[PDB]
Backbone:
């Protein structure tokens, strides 16, 4: 029973403890962002990485530290070392580059950020489970915006209904 | 002991 890092999505100095399940986009929507109002130079912070997990869709991405990754015994830890290398190489480059380059870099980061956001949006629902929860919710097989059909995933119906009820209505139309 | 086998989860 272990989790595997699929991809490092982002990196920040965040409030200590703002990691794990409370940082998913749906936890934040429901309960507020654990990193809200964090100001780097007035409160203790830590390096945190946004993780896309193998076998979990992008809505389940979480912020993690090197420490939490190790404590949870996740697989794919070689990707951390690679990420830290690329990051240090990128930061060296930024320090000298002409703002003409910095501009192009920033543009590619913004386009990338926008792409990543799409991955967390249900484009349409493809199928629903026969089994339903006590509360009557089936699970839903979801096609994600900007991802191919191979990246569809089963999702908790109660969770999907909080934000994508229109997709549900459309599927049952 | 025979090893036996929903696909939907959430981060808890």
Residues:
């Amino acid at each position: 029973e272990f989790e595997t890092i699929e991809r490092f999505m982002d990196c920040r100095i965040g409030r200590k403890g703002a990691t794990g399940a409370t940082t998913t986009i749906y936890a934040v929507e429901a309960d507020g962002d654990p990193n809200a109002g964090f100001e780097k130079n007035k409160e203790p912070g830590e390096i945190q990485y946004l993780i896309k997990w193998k076998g979990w869709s992008h809505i389940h991405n979480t912020w993690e530290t090197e420490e939490t990754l190790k404590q949870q015994n996740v697989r794919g830890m070689k990707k951390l070392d690679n990420y830290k290398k690329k990051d240090q190489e990128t930061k060296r480059w930024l320090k000298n580059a002409s703002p003409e380059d910095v501009e192009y870099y920033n543009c590619q980061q913004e386009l990338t950020d926008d792409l990543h956001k799409q991955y967390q949006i249900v484009e349409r629902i493809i199928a629903h489970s026969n089994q339903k929860s006590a509360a009557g919710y089936p699970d839903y097989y979801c096609k994600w915006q900007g991802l191919p059909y191979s990246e569809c995933s089963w999702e908790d119906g109660a969770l999907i209904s909080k934000k994508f009820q229109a997709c549900i209505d459309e599927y049952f139309s | 002991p025979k090893q036996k086998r929903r696909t939907a989860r959430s981060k808890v």
Strands of chain A lie at 5-15, 45-53, 62-64, 122-132, 138-144, 153-155. The longest strand of chain A covers residues 5-15.
